[model samples]
Target: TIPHLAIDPFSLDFFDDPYPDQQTLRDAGPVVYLDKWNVYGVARYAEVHAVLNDPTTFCSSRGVGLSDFKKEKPWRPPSLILEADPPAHTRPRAVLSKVLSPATMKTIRDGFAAAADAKVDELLQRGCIDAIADLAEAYPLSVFPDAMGLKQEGREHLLPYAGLVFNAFGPPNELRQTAIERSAPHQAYVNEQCQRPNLAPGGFGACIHAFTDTGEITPDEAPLLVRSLLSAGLDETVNGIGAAVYCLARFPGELQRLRSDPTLARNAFEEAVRFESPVQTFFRTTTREVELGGAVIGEGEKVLMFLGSANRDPRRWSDPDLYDITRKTSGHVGFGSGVHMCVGQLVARLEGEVMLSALARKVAAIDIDGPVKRRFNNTLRGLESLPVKLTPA
Candidate 1:
């Protein structure tokens, strides 16, 4: 029998600060059964990595949430790439890979770079601003929407709609309920924007629809794929940027390290992602009896992988708790692993590279000017407000 721990991961207490439970979960045993949720969990880096790589045995097709799609109707249309396994997952994955490839990002690189500089210039005038709202959220919202060819009006719906999607990944709790309540109009607006007619030609969303003509994915599937990008892509980038801001503000030495070697901007963002995983946890159900951490997990058991915990697992890193920009962070599970790895990570990187690099060159130092508030969600970690003061270079 797996070591059963009577803790609700989805509880508000856990979401506010998961490190304690993460440490407990990892140390309790490699494979721990959450008696509260009646699911198996793997908080260690190696086990989580194995579970992610072995998608065949730990299938995602049933649904990646607590609610198995095979058993209950999905609250919304399932993500083409995320909630799917191979064969059905291949075409969409390949198509999206090509769409977000380096070649395509290069075409729009100048546009994003310019947008980042402009946003920085605008925010620099304030000297003190909420990093989450003014810088992180502002930058992505300015560029990513236009890249997707989404209209300006009702664009506010994007974040809330995304919040609803991420929150729904956990059990039906108040956080998820609140997100659903606030996401209605935004959801409708986003759905309307995903339509072929609404998308601007030559945009990423339009590119997804192009698959319809090529017979790569059906016309019906195209919009849902577009929804996948719209839902999962933008917000994570926002969370990542916010995470970087928090990390740099908290660790001035790391910020100074970024200043001395401005080239480390990309690495800094990656490190911050590892330091503070934005997408905290996701569930995968076992396809058959599988042995992990010396315990045999029964088929169809909900196995939650504490990705944030795994990223900071001491078994994997030298000083897992320290925020060091110089550390090698290649194996970090921030973007996850295997085929189900975040498809839009390239876009997020582009956003980070452009924005963080510009900040490195222009901003001299960052300071936490006021209270920093943590935004709680069932499946995501980010800041609600990060009051920061920037010193010019």
Candidate 2:
């Protein structure tokens, strides 16, 4: 029998500080039934990993949210790549696979690196700052839009729109409701920007629109696909950068380690992803009654995979709770697992590497000068405000 926990994982209180609940969920069993949400929860790394790879049984087609698409209308059009399985997911995935290929990201590598240097120069002048606002959100917001070739007007809508998409993945509640109310106009703005005429020539959005020429994806799907790039790429990367900043502020030794070996910027970011996974939870519905960890979950049941919890599962990691830059985080479920793993992962890593590398070389230390306030969302974990004083080398 699966253990039933009465905890409400989607509650704002829980989102504020979820480590205790994460430990409880993992400790209860590999597969615990969440009485509050009526979903099966997998907190251990092994089980979460298995479910991600075995999408055939643990499908994402029904919807990767609390609201099952089959039973209810989606708050918005479902993600072609995210809310799909196999054959349905194949084309969109392939399209993005080529779009974000190593060679392609490499094209923008020098440009992104230069942006990081410029941003760091400005940040260094500030000395004291809200890292989340000044560094985390600013770096990506500054560069990604131009990369996508978007109009400068109404560009602020990107974050709100991305926030809405991430928040809507959880059970319909106050947070999701607020996002819905706020996102309506932003969503329309985003849709308008997705059109070919609105996208800048030779930009990421325009490139996605170009897929119509190859007959790989229709012109109708082009806009949504561009929406996918923005939806999945921006907020997550921003938060990942936020996570890195938070981790460095809280763990000075790791920051010093990074400073000594600036080359470890990539490793530091990878460890940050493991320590504070941006996308904390994602739902995968069971295709059929499936036995996992000696417990049988009924078909169509929602299984919530806690990526953050799994990343820190002691069974798969040594000193899991510690933020050690030296730890190998290659297999961590932070970027996720299997076919549905993050498509923009390389882009995120590139952004992290450039920003952290610039910091590692220029900033002597990251000191937390004020208490950090966290932003509560259904599926994503991020800091709303992170006050820090940076020391120059």
Candidate 3:
């Protein structure tokens, strides 16, 4: 049944900035079945977390994209890794988890920090820079593909492929069709790169072949699975980190937090992301009829989790709207929660922390050179431009 409390998803006002409406939805109660989208929405932090973490009741096997997997058709082949449920999700996830573990992540730490510092040093030499284009995107793009065993020769294809995967999670008609058209030519090269013959050593691509050899997953699923890791890596980190740097740059007092204590870098990064989630929203499917917020969700329905909403849930966070780094942010859903929660968040945080600290060392005031511009994407909360003036340290 539909709830009278439900609201429009694309009312322009909601689309431009949905935070106020998000809080309204959360307080309106949990599980509001929107007659408009004909789907269930979990707005509150507690409810959103339950739906995401409890995959059994939530059942991702149906599909995490807008289309239902249990339905005859699904958006793509369900993220092989991100879209599968337990038993199905277990093995692939295990393989991927092993490859991106904390120990493995440590291997890239020094290199990542060094690259970030060099990039900042170059940007600062000019004495001014656009944090997003110059620093944010540069760091991850510099480090990840090399770790993934890809060469920059034609690796420009990664971002577009990732963009399609993220956009395809939404409606299929115009947007998905448009993305599919653009990605057609590049798909073959990407697929070829995923193959064992095409991969380089000590990279995710090569590991996929090894995983397949061990029969962890088939040779067929191996390439696409690596594609998942490849596709997920750079974009959000690039945009989100830029946004985070901009936030720290804006808050005049944050420098003391950094200079006085470099350890707080991770927390500061998280606060920026929480205040402005780079990967804004993702979808989930309902496996059973669940009652929430006076509304009932029918079996085989989809639930959209607004990561931004959960991060700022007034019921869950103290100053829901303020950008304060000192607040306890350990439990915030910025990187997400549950088994399917992003495994690469720490790496992303590390890159952001190291480089941001480097910038703090060189620049005193990161004043925006001009107004910033948002990069509109169907799934990612990103920036198109972030102009800045480094108060030279």
Candidate 4:
């Protein structure tokens, strides 16, 4: 019989802003069972790092979604690339890792930087434009599609694909249900395109297929691996890039500093990632009984790490809440730490630096015009939309 613990994690207030609840959980202990949800939670930086790195103990094979994949219906199979631990998880990651290498990133970096500059000029000509959709979404969607060699047949499907995949991380709520219904309509086409032979040669997809010859991942697994990269990389980038601009607006002194140095744009992006983590939390299941900060977690239990809260954890940082672009923000959990630390994060960094540097070079000033609305999704924090006034010279 399951022990009866009355904890209501589904309460809307907790959903809206969970930092206070995260602090309460951290103070309670390193691992605490939420009486309502029947799942354990971890809020501190050290323990979260431990779980992320020690995947052997905190296996992701059952699925990283709130409900174990073996037990519940999944949107699709758990990501063979992102959901498995090393040895089991390592090979596929290696196969796909080659798809977005640093050398390759460097080759495209200038093109991406120029895209930002061109887009900024257009926005300046338009008088005022929302940075979120225009520069953030437009920049990546434009560059990424052509780079991947996706054809014109059905390329306009990037945003909703990633949006639904990210929401699939949460419990089946109204938002979850809505995403499923919306994405369910397109799952067939998306899955079909993810098949090995469908993707273009010399692109991210072809690179994954090449691994099959090397005995790394099976040919069957290659396409789904491409899907995993697609689900993880593209849309979240829009948020990260957009968040960089929002962070800059909040800190004019920092923006001027970046303008003067320009090199600080990379650091500024890192700082914003620390300030506002796009991927908020992920879960790990305990393989054996473990003692964490005086709390005893039983074997086969699950715990969630709120990376957003840990990013602001006062213990791990000095004035952890402040958004100073100059800070040495290397250790932030924005890309996370451990084996699963985002494989495509370097790509994300390049995107942010390019987009932000172009803005700083051309835009004389920026200001938020109204209360910015939050894009209501369970994971990947970002704006629903923002009304910002821009002045570009």
Candidate 5:
């Protein structure tokens, strides 16, 4: 029998501070039944990893959310890549993988570096700023849209639209309800931007649309693929950069270490991803009866994978809770694992690397100047406001 816990992982209280509940879940058992949400959860690293790697047994097509698509209508059309399983997921994934390849990263590298340097220069002159707003949100909001070739107008809708998309993944709670109520115009804006005409020539969005010429994906499918980039791209990187800054702010010693060897910037960002796990949880449905953590979960059942818990699972890392930038963070599921792993990972890493690297080169120290505000969402964890004072090197 599976140990059952009546924990609402989506509750505001849990969102405020989830580590304690995550520990409890990990301690409960390998496969614990979440009574409140009626879903099985895997908090330990091994189980979560295994489930993610074996997509055939743990399918994504049914839906990677609390509301199973097989049983209910999706709030929107399912993501061609994120919400899909193999065969159907193959071509779109291939197209996106090529679009975000190392070659593309190389093309965008200089531009991203220039933007990071300019942003850092401006922030350093100010000395103090809300890192979340001024740096984290601003940096990506500036660069990613250009990379995607999106028009300059109405860019504010991106975050709100992403918030709604991620919130819809959880049970229809107040957060999801509220986001839906205010989502109309933002959704429309995003949809309009995904069209080929709205996308700039030779941009990532244009690259995705070019797949229509090769017959890799249809003309109709091209816009949805662009939508995939729009939905998944910006928010994670924004929170990721925020998480790195938060970690450095909280652990001054680590920031000093980073400043000592500026090359550690990439590793610092990776460590933050592990420590904070921007994407906290994602649901996967069982394709057939499978045994996980000594319990048999039936086919068609929902299994919530606590990615944040797995990253901090002591069973996986030595001194897991410590935010050590030098710690070898390889194999951490912060970007998730398996065939359905985060497709935009390289782009996110590029953004994180350039932003952190620029900060390391320019700023001597980062000090928390005020209370850090937490951004609440059903699936993502990040700061709403991170007040910080930066000293020039």
Candidate 6:
């Protein structure tokens, strides 16, 4: 029998300090059963990677959350990309891949860098700053929305809507229920913003909509693809950037390494992603009776992959807990792996790289200035407020 555990991973208590349970889960066995949610979990790197790579067996179409799409009505339309499997997943992925490709990143690089520089300059002038509010959240909010051509009026809804979306991935607990009750206005704004007429031409949303003209995806599917981008884009990047700043503040040696070689900015962000694993966990439903990590799971069962745990698995990295900017972080499951790997990763990486590079160039040292607060959510890991004092270089 699979090793069974009754821990509620989604509880606020677990969210408060997850590493201990994560370690327990990873050490329990290759696969463990969580009786609380009746789900199997894989917290080790190897098993997590294998399951992600084999989507046919641990399929996403049934729903990538605790609630099976076949059984329960989705709170909103399922993401055409994130919640979809092959054939169904292929075309939208291609369109988004092209839309957010390296070339697009190149086009937006100057703008993103300029925004980073401006934000860093403001922080330098202030000397003390809330890294989460002043830098991480502000920078991405400025650049990404512009890239997507979303207007300025209701951008505040982005984070709340994203929080609700991620929380819905878990069981209908208090957190998710509370989010749902407050979500109507945020949902309305996001839906409206996804429409083509509301999108500025030459932006990512417009570009996605352009696919309809070429007959690649239908007119109806266009807004949903744009909605998919909106759904996946903002919060993760915000958390990734905040996580990088938080990591640097807590690990000064890594900050020193980054300052010594400014070019390591990209690597610094990647390392932070590996160290922090901003997007913590995601569930996959099995399509058939499949054997994973030494256990056979029945069809339509939920398998929770502990991405943060996998990234820190001692089995995968030397000195796994150490936050090293110089470390090779190519295979970390932070942004996930395989076909469903984060479609907006290039955008997130660009934001992280430029922001860290700007900080490296301008700030001599980063010290935690005040209390650091962690934001709790079912699937996202990030700081709510990170007060920091930056010494000028």
Model 2 global lDDT (CA atoms, 0 to 1): 0.90
Candidate 2 lDDT over 327-370, as tens digits, reads 88889999989998888888899999999999998998888998
**TM-score of every model versus the real structure:** 0.97, 0.98, 0.93, 0.93, 0.99, 0.98
lDDT of 6 by residue, 1-393 (tens): 699998899998898988999999999999999999999999999999999999889889888888999999999988888889998999989999999998889889999999999999988999999999888899988898899999988988888888888898888898888888868899899999989899999999999998888777899999889988778767788888898888888898888888889999999999988888888999999889988877899998999999999999999999998888989999999988999998888888889999999988988889998999989888888889999999999
lDDT of each: 0.88, 0.90, 0.76, 0.76, 0.91, 0.90
Report the C-alpha lDDT of model 5 over 280-346, residue by residue, as the tens digit: 9999999899988779999899999999999999988999878998999999999999898888889
> Tens digits of per-residue lDDT for model 1 on 1-393?
678898898887887878888999999989998888788999999999999999999999999888888788888878888889998999999889988998999888999999988887788888999999899999998888888888788887788888888888888778777776656687788788889999999999999998788888999888888988778877778999999988888888888888888889888888888988888888999999999989998888889999999999999999999989888999899898998898888898889988888888888888998998988888888989999898888
Q: Encode model 3's per-residue lDDT on 133-179: one tens digit a residue.
A: 77888788888888888866778787788778777776554556778
Residue 287, candidate 1: C-alpha displacement in angstroms = 1.0
Model 4 lDDT tens row, 1-393: 122334334445665676777677666666666666678777788787777777767778766767776567767777886778777778877766677888779778888888878888888897567777777778888788766656667766767888888888877787778888857656666676777667788777777787789898888887788787668777678888778888778877777887787778788888888887888777777777877666677877777778887888787888877779889887888787877778888788888888778877888777887667677677778776766778874
Model 3 misses residue 226 by how many Å? 0.5
lDDT of 3 at 301: 81
Model 3: runs farther than 4 Å from truth?
1-13
TM-score (C-alpha, index-matched) for candidate 3: 0.93
Query: Which residue pairs come into collision in candidate 1?
Result: none
Candidate 6 local lDDT, residue 202: 92
Per lDDT, the best of the predicted structures is 5
Tell me the lDDT of candidate 4: 0.76
Task: Check candidate 4 and list the clashing pairs.
Answer: 7-35, 7-36, 375-384
Clashes of each: 0, 0, 1, 3, 0, 0
